[PDB]
Amino acid sequence: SLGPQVAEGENVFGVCHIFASFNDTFVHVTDLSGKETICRVTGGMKVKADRDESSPYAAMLAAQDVAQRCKELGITALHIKLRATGGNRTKTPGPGAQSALRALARSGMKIGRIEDVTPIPSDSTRRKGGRRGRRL
Amino acid sequence: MSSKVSRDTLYEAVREVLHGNQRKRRKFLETVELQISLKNYDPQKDKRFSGTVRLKSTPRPKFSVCVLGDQQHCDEAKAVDIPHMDIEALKKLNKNKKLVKKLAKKYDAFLASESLIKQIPRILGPGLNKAGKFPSLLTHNENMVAKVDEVKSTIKFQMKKVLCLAVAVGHVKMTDDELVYNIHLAVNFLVSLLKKNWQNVRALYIKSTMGKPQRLY
Amino acid sequence: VVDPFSKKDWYDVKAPAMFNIRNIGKTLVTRTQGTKIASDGLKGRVFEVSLADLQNDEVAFRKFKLITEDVQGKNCLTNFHGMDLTRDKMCSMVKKWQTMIEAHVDVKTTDGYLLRLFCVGFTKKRNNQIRKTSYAQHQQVRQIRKKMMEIMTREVQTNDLKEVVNKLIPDSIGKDIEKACQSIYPLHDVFVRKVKMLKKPKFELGKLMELHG
RNA sequence: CCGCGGCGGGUGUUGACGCGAUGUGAUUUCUGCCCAGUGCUCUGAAUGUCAAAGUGAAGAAAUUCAAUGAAGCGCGGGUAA
RNA sequence: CCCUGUUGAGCUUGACUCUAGUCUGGCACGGUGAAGAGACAUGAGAGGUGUAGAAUAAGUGGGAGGCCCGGGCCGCCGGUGAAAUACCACUACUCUGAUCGUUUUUUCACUGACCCGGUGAGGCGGGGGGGCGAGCCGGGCUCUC
RNA sequence: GCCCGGAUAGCUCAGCGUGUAGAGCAUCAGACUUUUAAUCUGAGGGUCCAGGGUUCAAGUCCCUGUUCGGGCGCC
Ligand SMILES: [Mg+2]
Ligand SMILES: [Mg+2]
Ligand SMILES: [Mg+2]
Ligand SMILES: [Mg+2]
Ligand SMILES: [Mg+2]
Ligand SMILES: [Mg+2]
């Protein structure tokens, strides 16, 4: 765990990846390439109930751990890449987003740029489900 | 766990290990004990290890005996400083009193004669078979000649399930020339009370109150 | 049973020398431990950098990409790799009751890179217009993408890679097509939406260094 | 697949639209349920049993006793043109 | 045909006793270099819940006052349980790690034994000159050429 | 002969040295305007047989009564 920088002169950047499904939520903090990672923790490691794998409190219990594991290594600022499930399936980011971003911004980081990287296809294949569709 | 003057692994001669006056870390009198480790002698087996050895040097414990008996030992030893008593002392010492400030207890050595063998294992059995005051045939209870020895520096020892022996041998207050007549009789009779197997004497200690061992040869 | 993050070194990454800011950030690499080389596993890394954190006061809805090519020691040197348009902008620009126009063309510069360029153009609602549609024709579309194919090649066939960047930091092409297509039908929302490099030349070492002074 | 044998020999001057080993019997039409059994195969330290060798101790030694222990059978999944 | 013989042949399998071939281990011909996985031995640190009881008294054999400064905190008797905790240890259990040995270890590595293919055994590796052309601060030549 | 595991209420069946669990049958009630299905109490337990040692055994050891694996073989 090393740092060559000075504090107020500049802000050392990293970048996160906020995956947000309807049943699970990733946070994956990597570097500017994305090739080199720093830490990764899921929602599922912390709550022993699979019906709230993606409760909003289950993202806060892992985002606090990420900003706790990263302050020992010297990162002040982060970029954000937000990302739904994408594809031919849905495209609405679930509820585990707006309380995990505030959950680490409140936990003392320097938020940079915000964008969307949801994989929107130009021309989809066929979604799983019949012509009358999943009825229940 | 330590004792600064004497090291435990150096093996001093039988008089050089009487350097024990430098063990005085305590003002009072240490209970000098022994923790010998028998090897190749399974406590599971029918091979018994429970016996007596009379020492010499009056190691100054306090002794309280409740001899039980119904014999001509009532007219043989009632001048020899023991509270000997008849079956009224069995009705007495039966453990009806598990109560405040008085128990049917506080006697370091009991007795079973041949006439009261169908009593002390009957009446006081579950109350005296676990503290150790239960008489038997390997605890050496006839006590017409040996009760003065159970006054003296005689000691008793038996086997333990974690492969050791613990017995009291002296007190660090006495002189070295009496601790040598504690060393002679201490190292003499464990070979004869130990039977033919892998080597007998392996891990001999001297012990005290807040103390550490010191090994001899 | 060992933390592997002390087995790393942080490096820096630079930019070419037609921009303002040189530094981008820090990127950790393992040490050269036996066979694997810290220059090698670092050289093929791509940096997605927005242009408003490369300039002082320009727009922020344009992004560049910069690969690494050469190791100087705590110093990676970068080259142009392509340009992106933000999903904020493009989806905030496509709206109903206007006509969309796209185009794409390939071009080789004077030293050779095989750039592929895309574009887009939206028609503009007039001032006093009460007719709701404001659609274009189809012959006026084909007579528009003929000009965009004429211009991207014309601005590219006769210069190198260093000066088309200075023709892409402003919106100098979208200005030109907006003012050479205002005659037919008035469009307002013109961009070149993606520039992609296909086939890079031989690794000549100090054309970059010329791009670093 | 041959052969007493070797860097031996056929298939093979061949290469999966190819060699080799099987059951049914044209076309049209259909080909059902069962993997407990006997076979076959796959995960095997997920382990009960398991030689020679190499190892330790007691003995004057020949010996005697202990740890460890490959495949395969056992245990667990797949398979009925 | 049918029966008997202590007479035989051809075939079959869960008959009895054996065998070519094939699978696996060991010793050899059989070398040169580094890393990693153990079998623990000496010896180190950690924990324990039917409560009762000064606690979680795992089990020791005693001890009847020290400890720490004539003074203060605790009995073994109580308080109360199956054994009592003031009083030191040894002995187990498993966890973890350094340790030297131990040792059975597996992947990566070189080429010289050995094995394979190809040829009428026909231009191999270094180093030069010549070339695309160059950090061009032209030059020592740089990845291909 | 060698080693090895297995037996608990009327059927299948849990048991973590300090206590006999469970699901399904048989009753009686409750819920529903009334039948179905679900809800709950209750009745049934010698922990396959004798001993051990332990304060305390269904539990570790021991053997005998019952089912089964495997490798072995000179009267
Ligand atoms: Mg067939
Ligand atoms: Mg079958
Ligand atoms: Mg005959
Ligand atoms: Mg015959
Ligand atoms: Mg047969
Ligand atoms: Mg009723």
Swiss-Prot record, chain A:
Signal peptide: none annotated. The keyword Membrane does not apply. Its main location: cytoplasm. Residues 127-136 have a biased composition (Basic residues). There is a cross-link at K46, K48, K91 (Glycyl lysine isopeptide (Lys-Gly) (interchain with G-Cter in SUMO2)). InterPro entries: Ribosomal_uS11, Ribosomal_uS11_CS, Ribosomal_uS11_sf. It is found in: Cytoplasm; Nucleus, Nucleolus. Keywords: Cytoplasm, Isopeptide bond, Nucleus, Phosphoprotein, Ribonucleoprotein, Ribosomal protein, Ubl conjugation. The modification Phosphothreonine is found at T118. Pfam families: Ribosomal_S11. The keyword Phosphoprotein applies. One of its GO terms (molecular function) is structural constituent of ribosome. NCBIfam families: PRK09607.1. Component of the small ribosomal subunit. The ribosome is a large ribonucleoprotein complex responsible for the synthesis of proteins in the cell. Part of the small subunit (SSU) processome, first precursor of the small eukaryotic ribosomal subunit. During the assembly of the SSU processome in the nucleolus, many ribosome biogenesis factors, an RNA chaperone and ribosomal proteins associate with the nascent pre-rRNA and work in concert to generate RNA folding, modifications, rearrangements and cleavage as well as targeted degradation of pre-ribosomal RNA by the RNA exosome. Component of the small ribosomal subunit. Part of the small subunit (SSU) processome, composed of more than 70 proteins and the RNA chaperone small nucleolar RNA (snoRNA) U3. Belongs to the universal ribosomal protein uS11 family. This is Small ribosomal subunit protein uS11. It comes from Oryctolagus cuniculus. The lineage of its organism: Eukaryota, Metazoa, Chordata, Craniata, Vertebrata. The gene is RPS14.
From Swiss-Prot, chain B:
It holds the Pfam family Ribosomal_L1. There is a cross-link at K118, K161 (Glycyl lysine isopeptide (Lys-Gly) (interchain with G-Cter in SUMO2)). One of its GO terms (molecular function) is RNA binding. Its main location: cytoplasm. The modification N6-acetyllysine is found at K91, K106, K118. Component of the large ribosomal subunit. The ribosome is a large ribonucleoprotein complex responsible for the synthesis of proteins in the cell. Component of the large ribosomal subunit. This is Large ribosomal subunit protein uL1. The lineage of its organism: Eukaryota, Metazoa, Chordata, Craniata, Vertebrata. The gene is RPL10A.
From Swiss-Prot, chain C:
There is a cross-link at K14 (Glycyl lysine isopeptide (Lys-Gly) (interchain with G-Cter in SUMO2)). Its main location: cytoplasm. The modification N6-acetyllysine is found at K14, K36. GO terms for biological process: cell differentiation; translation. The modification ADP-ribosyltyrosine is found at Y135. ADP-ribosylated at Tyr-135 by PARP1 in presence of HPF1. It is found in: Cytoplasm; Nucleus; Nucleus, Nucleolus. GO terms for molecular function: structural constituent of ribosome. Belongs to the eukaryotic ribosomal protein eS1 family. Component of the small ribosomal subunit. Mature ribosomes consist of a small (40S) and a large (60S) subunit. The 40S subunit contains about 33 different proteins and 1 molecule of RNA (18S). The 60S subunit contains about 49 different proteins and 3 molecules of RNA (28S, 5.8S and 5S). Identified in a IGF2BP1-dependent mRNP granule complex containing untranslated mRNAs. Binds with high affinity to IPO4. Interacts with DDIT3. Part of the small subunit (SSU) processome, composed of more than 70 proteins and the RNA chaperone small nucleolar RNA (snoRNA) U3. Component of the small ribosomal subunit. The ribosome is a large ribonucleoprotein complex responsible for the synthesis of proteins in the cell. Part of the small subunit (SSU) processome, first precursor of the small eukaryotic ribosomal subunit. During the assembly of the SSU processome in the nucleolus, many ribosome biogenesis factors, an RNA chaperone and ribosomal proteins associate with the nascent pre-rRNA and work in concert to generate RNA folding, modifications, rearrangements and cleavage as well as targeted degradation of pre-ribosomal RNA by the RNA exosome. This is Small ribosomal subunit protein eS1. It comes from Oryctolagus cuniculus (Rabbit). The chain holds residues 21 to 233 of 264 of the full protein.
